[PDB]
Amino acid sequence: AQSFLNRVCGVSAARLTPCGTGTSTDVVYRAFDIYNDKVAGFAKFLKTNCCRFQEKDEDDNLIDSYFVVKRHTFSNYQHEETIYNLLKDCPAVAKHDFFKFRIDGDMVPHISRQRLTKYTMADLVYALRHFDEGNCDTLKEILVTYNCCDDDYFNKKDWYDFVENPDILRVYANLGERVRQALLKTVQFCDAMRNAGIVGVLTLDNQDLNGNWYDFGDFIQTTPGSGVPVVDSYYSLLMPILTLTRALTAESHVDTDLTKPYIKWDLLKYDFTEERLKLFDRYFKYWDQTYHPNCVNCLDDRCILHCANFNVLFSTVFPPTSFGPLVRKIFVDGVPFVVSTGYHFRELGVVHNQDVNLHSSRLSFKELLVYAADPAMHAASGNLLLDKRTTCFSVAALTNNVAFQTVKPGNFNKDFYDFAVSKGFFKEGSSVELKHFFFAQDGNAAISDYDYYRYNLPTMCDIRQLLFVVEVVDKYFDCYDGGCINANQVIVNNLDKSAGFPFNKWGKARLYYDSMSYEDQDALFAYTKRNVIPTITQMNLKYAISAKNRARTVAGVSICSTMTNRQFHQKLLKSIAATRGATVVIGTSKFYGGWHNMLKTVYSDVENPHLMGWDYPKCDRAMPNMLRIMASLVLARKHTTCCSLSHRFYRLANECAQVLSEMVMCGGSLYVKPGGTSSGDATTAYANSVFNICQAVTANVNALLSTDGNKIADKYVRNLQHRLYECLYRNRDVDTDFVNEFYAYLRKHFSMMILSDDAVVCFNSTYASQGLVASIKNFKSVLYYQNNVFMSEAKC
Amino acid sequence: NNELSPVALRQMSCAAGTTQTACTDDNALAYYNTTKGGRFVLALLSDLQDLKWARFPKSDGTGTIYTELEPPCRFVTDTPKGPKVKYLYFIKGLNNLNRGMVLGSLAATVRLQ
Amino acid sequence: KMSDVKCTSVVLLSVLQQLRVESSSKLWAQCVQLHNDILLAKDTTEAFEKMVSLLSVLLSMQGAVDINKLCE
Amino acid sequence: NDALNNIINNARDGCVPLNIIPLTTAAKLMVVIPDYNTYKNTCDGTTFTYASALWEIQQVVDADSKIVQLSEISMDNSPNLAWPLIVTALRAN
Ligand SMILES: [Zn+2]
Ligand SMILES: [Zn+2]
């Protein structure tokens, strides 16, 4: 015992305190990334085989420095010894011992790994992904250990929620530089493994919170100079934490250190391609897939997503001013103009128009229509604005005064009220009581609603999981059909509706549909397939009854977007709205037995049926950018024939340019919308349906891979788990067979009925209890780490 | 316990050459991954110094696909014939995982020095 | 009885707005605060003191002849 | 048409992000302040700085669009004012 402790300390001469009684191991409960030929998954197990020794400091203080010793056979001892004395000089490598000790009466080899931390990054990842309000423990310990916060902070009410505690983002940000250091150190590990010829799979199980790597028990060696570290599961599982913890902030400072001031970029610099490649080289040097700084050069939709993810990460570095429309001066009839000619998307990069006309002669009706719609000229003519009422970037003010809008109290029908009271209603102790009213608002309503678009943050999504989710979701829209239509096939519900800021001043949408011919409409539609047209959406204060004093607003979008999204999603969506018996239920009436038919469809062959419902905290103002791009993409998938790739990409560019991050004029002033979605385009409800389906399926996958995988009984489900892991983190291409099988699995065991942001699911109880399908817990975890919102019990 | 590649990947002979139609008849040890959506080869092994083109007819036989290769990767292996110094090649676009599994299979199932 | 309270609060704020009290931003803000408080309240005693508080705003003006309007 | 020409002449190809056009060329600024405290930090005194430029005060109004003098905005006199205050300034040269 005493000699064992004296040997573990060895030449180090530390003050090892045996946090484990005698020469016995210490079984801990830690998360692992496992892939054998039997079981696969990222799940938390029980670890034997190690005895731990915390180091003591001078004044009997205990520091997070542990001497983990591993007991195993002789074969592994030799295997790790012969490959530890190959890469011993890499700073990313923890120092090993490789001794032998006379445990009991026989000789056993032990490998002493020295100076690790209590938790590896696997614990951090599993804690921040699979969160529980009442099972934090390890998250609290990590968060307090590294002087990010204090313990009395955890006594705060709803400390863990982003919405009503906007300080929790600051707390997580104090852990951020450690992850940057870990990546910056694992890059040299990869380089040394290359230089010395080692082949294997790096996992975030064997990397400490310092960044040191300490396990080689599954590795093989080859000729030096050609090593292939398989960084595929590692980066994929580590993605979300980088943007949740804001781990790249150091790049905003000069010389990459938080102490020094920020880098003062040139205001007129708009193309940051070189910096994007520089950061990608610095931090993800060994990521096999190619990277396109500008999403124009992508090969198809999947490469668009894969490049957009890294762009979303890197866009937190560059100044906020260099994002938006790109203006150029063009003379028409000798008159210099200021017209939009290109755009700088945070997620897509730089896109230049192809049909820009310089030194034109006359402006036809379509040219005047376009040059009067984009905010370029209105912005270049206005005066600079600075508003302290909100945090989101502001552009300018069109007028010389700021108009203030309010709401009216709503009128009272005393006749019906008296007739009701005379009928024994509205008395004391009644189960019926007035809970719906026409509330009023002050002169600050919309500006108090835009700080709800404040709640949206730059978000990365786990990219490989997201790609597979796109593939599986693509099947739920397989029975539908659509494609481009000419100007003669559009059908408009009501023509007496407003057009927008720079059009409402003169007429209504009837005037514009009936002034320009069909040929002009087709010309504009074809123009939008090789350019970008920024627009302005007006923000409007709704006037209706509600159960809570919230000033809900609506968005009146401009008319160019109306035509150029109608001519496309009209045929896409009229198929959806007229189809019965599908998961999407939009366009079906509840009357004439429709509601009963819906419910009978929901209960379609559910074995152990139970019902579950949820509601997202703020569906419209928190939806991360990537999921909206995904919705637009899976809606645009139905154009494999009618258009080429560049046309699809430009349509998506216009969609994200006038619905995602556009300029809203609220009270006579232009503000930039950080993200979210605008209710008032042609495709809000269906996009929200797509988002709901995506969240449900990703919750299902995250649930099924969180399971142990050894206690699982049915061989079919175990094979499903193994192949699902293989298809997520080990396949570069799509597998139609397995996605077919998996879609069949969910449709059999987990049935959904979806309308806009609201959902009803019938699910198998046994599978949920065994963790085979998603439950309320997994779904809440998914919302937490992919929407920056914590759902409570009052919404589910 | 993330194991590199359970189950081994076997080989089959194939044709390669330096350029255009230089694939003569049969010169390469193609290590191939059989998927029922079509046989998809991973690696090429040769005693020929510089082969950048490789050839394989499709299943129908009316077409014949060409594949491109990396710069040669040197190694030497011990066999009954003594030391044999060979070059392995990978098709461009090959992810790191396929390289990892093929090198694991080679370094486990083939003697090397 | 609180139903009558909420109904008369609604009508009172309606007449206050039609009296262009909204042209004083702070006054209208306070009146809106009081209205939103009354409709959301659950106890009757608090509603009475809030409604008399916001009615004092009406009675401080000189645009509504009370004595003629109180015809009984 | 004088200042904007200077900036656009300085671009590599002529393209400049739109958001800096009113940041460098606009000749007027208006600031909306929610309370006296934030007013102290930004628009204290008869002139202030922002966007690497010096701006001079000329006019202040409240939510009711009526004149209010710079002496009137004190800590004690503050609760007697509407507080989306509007202040306009001119680019000093
Ligand atoms: Zn790409
Ligand atoms: Zn098309």
- Using CA atoms, how far residue B70 sits from A695, B44, B94, B99, in Å, is 41, 10, 10, 12
C63: domain range?
2-72
A531 annotated to a ligand binding site: no
- Which alpha helices (H) appear in chain D, and where do they start and end? 3-9, 21-24, 36-43
Whole-number Å distance between alpha carbons of A708 and A718: 10
Instruction: Name the residue in chain D with its Cα closest to that of C26.
Output: D82
Beta-strand ranges (E) seen in A504-550 are 536-541
Q: What is the CA radius of gyration of chain B?
A: 14
> Ligand 2 centre and the CA of A567: distance in Å?
9
Instruction: Name the residue in chain C with its Cα closest to that of A438.
Output: C10
Three-state SS at A114: strand
Whole-number Å distance between alpha carbons of A109 and A318: 53
- Which alpha helices (H) appear in A146-249, and where do they start and end? 168-173, 176-195, 233-244
Q: Quote the tokens at residue A623.
A: 């939806």
Q: Characterise A442 by phi-psi region: left (phi > 0), alpha (psi -120 to 50), beta (else).
A: beta
Place of tokens 């004083």: C24
Q: Are A561 and A532 in contact (CB under 8 A)?
A: no
Interface with A, mutate which of C1, C2, C6, C7 (most A CBs under 10 A): C7
Whole-number Å distance between alpha carbons of B46 and B51: 8
User: Which of chain B's residues have a Cβ under 8 Å away from the Cβ of A218?
Assistant: 1-4
Whole-number Å distance between alpha carbons of A653 and A528: 10
B71: domain range?
9-111
Domain count, chain B: 1
Sequence-ordered list of residues with C-beta below 8 angstroms from that of A520, at least 6 positions apart, any chain:
A365, A366
Residue type, B81: K
> Which residues are bridge partners to B12 per DSSP?
B30
Distance of residue B111 Cα from the nearest chain A Cα, in angstroms: 11
Whole-number Å distance between alpha carbons of A508 and A194: 66
> Ligand 1 centre and the CA of A289: distance in Å?
9
Q: Quote the tokens at residue C53.
A: 């508080």
The backbone torsions φ and ψ at residue A245, rounded to the nearest 5 degrees and listed phi first, read -100, 0
Instruction: Name the residue in chain D with its Cα closest to that of A447.
Output: D84
Q: Are B16 and B53 in contact (CB under 8 A)?
A: yes
Q: How many helices (H) and strands (E) does chain B have?
A: 1, 7
Interface C:A, ≥3 CB–CB pairs < 8 Å: yes
Residue type, A753: M
Whole-number Å distance between alpha carbons of A172 and A161: 12
Which subunits have 3 or more CB–CB pairs within 8 Å of chain D? A, C
Whole-number Å distance between alpha carbons of B88 and A185: 31
The backbone torsions φ and ψ at residue A57, rounded to the nearest 5 degrees and listed phi first, read -115, 120
> Ligand 2 centre and the CA of A477: distance in Å?
17
Q: Quote the tokens at residue A482.
A: 């659509």
Domain count, chain C: 1
Q: Characterise A49 by phi-psi region: left (phi > 0), alpha (psi -120 to 50), beta (else).
A: left
The backbone torsions φ and ψ at residue A306, rounded to the nearest 5 degrees and listed phi first, read -70, -35
Evaluate whether residue B4 is within a structural domain: no
Residue A383 to residue D50, Cβ atoms within 8 A: no
Nearest to A151 by CA among A141, A161, A160: A141
Residue D82 to residue C25, Cβ atoms within 8 A: yes
Nearest to A280 by CA among A349, A228, A226: A349
Between helix A233-244 and helix A301-314 the angle, nearest 10°, is 50
Distance of residue A618 Cα from the nearest chain C Cα, in angstroms: 22
Q: Are D42 and D31 in contact (CB under 8 A)?
A: yes
A639 annotated to a ligand binding site: yes
Q: Are B9 and B32 in contact (CB under 8 A)?
A: yes
Q: Are A330 and A357 in contact (CB under 8 A)?
A: yes
Which subunits have 3 or more CB–CB pairs within 8 Å of chain A? B, C, D
Residue A230 to residue B112, Cβ atoms within 8 A: no
CA dihedral C40, C44, C49, C54 (to 10 degrees): 40
Sequence-ordered list of residues with C-beta below 8 angstroms from that of A772, at least 6 positions apart, any chain:
A703, A704, A707, A712, A717, A749, A764, A766
The backbone torsions φ and ψ at residue B79, rounded to the nearest 5 degrees and listed phi first, read -145, 175
Whole-number Å distance between alpha carbons of A284 and A183: 8
Q: What is the CA radius of gyration of chain C?
A: 12
Interface with D, mutate which of A273, A384, A661 (most D CBs under 10 A): A384
Which residues of A are marked as active site? Answer: 756-758
Three-state SS at B67: strand
Interchain CB contact of D16 with A (< 8 Å): yes
Q: Quote the tokens at residue A485.
A: 């239509």
Interface with D, mutate which of A270, A327, A532, A663 (most D CBs under 10 A): A327
Q: Which ligand places an atom closest to the C-alpha of A302? A: 1
A303 annotated to a ligand binding site: yes
Q: Which of residues 385-414 of A touch C (CB under 8 A)?
A: 404, 406, 408-412, 414
Interchain CB contact of D9 with A (< 8 Å): no
Q: Which of residues 733-772 of A touch B (CB under 8 A)?
A: 736-737
Residue D21 to residue A324, Cβ atoms within 8 A: no
Q: Are A406 and A445 in contact (CB under 8 A)?
A: yes
Three-state SS at A758: strand
Instruction: Name the residue in chain D with its Cα closest to that of A390.
Output: D34
Instruction: Name the residue in chain C with its Cα closest to that of D84.
Output: C25
Whole-number Å distance between alpha carbons of C31 and B100: 72
Q: How many helices (H) and strands (E) does chain D have?
A: 3, 5
Evaluate whether residue B99 is within a structural domain: yes
User: Which of chain D's residues have a Cβ under 8 Å away from the Cβ of A327?
Assistant: 15-18, 21
A642 annotated to a ligand binding site: yes
Q: b vs e for A32-55, b when ≥16 Cβ sit within 10 Å of the residue's Cβ? A: bbbbeeebbbbbbeeeeebbbbbb
**Cα C22–Cα C28–Cα C29 angle in degrees, nearest 5:** 135
Sequence-ordered list of residues with C-beta below 8 angstroms from that of B87, at least 6 positions apart, any chain:
B45, B46, B47, B48, B49, B51, B72, B73, B74, B75
Q: What own/partner pairs with CB < 8 Å and gap ≥ 24 does A106-112 have?
A: A108/A71, A109/A71, A109/A72, A109/A73, A109/A74, A109/A77, A110/A69, A110/A70, A110/A71, A111/A69, A111/A70, A111/A72, A111/A77, A111/A80, A112/A8, A112/A10, A112/A67, A112/A68, A112/A69
Question: What letter would DSSP give residue A297?
Answer: G
Q: Are A580 and A598 in contact (CB under 8 A)?
A: no
Burial class (CB within 10 angstroms; exposed 0-12, middle 13-18, buried 19+) of A300: exposed
Q: Characterise B7 by phi-psi region: left (phi > 0), alpha (psi -120 to 50), beta (else).
A: left
Whole-number Å distance between alpha carbons of A556 and A665: 11
Q: Quote the tokens at residue A706.
A: 């969180």
Q: Are A33 and A233 in contact (CB under 8 A)?
A: yes
Whole-number Å distance between alpha carbons of A541 and A405: 8
The backbone torsions φ and ψ at residue A85, rounded to the nearest 5 degrees and listed phi first, read -90, 45
Whole-number Å distance between alpha carbons of A512 and B83: 82
Sequence-ordered list of residues with C-beta below 8 angstroms from that of B103, at least 6 positions apart, any chain:
A199, A220, A222, A228
Pairing of strands A536-541, A663-665: parallel
> Ligand 2 centre and the CA of A577: distance in Å?
20
Q: Are D61 and D86 in contact (CB under 8 A)?
A: yes
Q: What share of chain D is helix, strand, coil (3-state, %, to 5)?
A: 30, 30, 40
Sequence-ordered list of residues with C-beta below 8 angstroms from that of A291, at least 6 positions apart, any chain:
A277, A280, A307, A310
A190 annotated to a ligand binding site: no
Q: For domain D3-92, give the CATH number.
A: 3.30.70.3540
Q: Which helix (H) or strand (E) holds B97?
A: helix B96-109
A643 annotated to a ligand binding site: yes
Q: Quote the tokens at residue D92.
A: 């000093």
Nearest to A193 by CA among A90, A91, A95, A281: A90
Distance of residue B28 Cα from the nearest chain A Cα, in angstroms: 21
Q: Characterise A283 by phi-psi region: left (phi > 0), alpha (psi -120 to 50), beta (else).
A: alpha
Whole-number Å distance between alpha carbons of A204 and A213: 9
Q: Quote the tokens at residue A201.
A: 């799979």
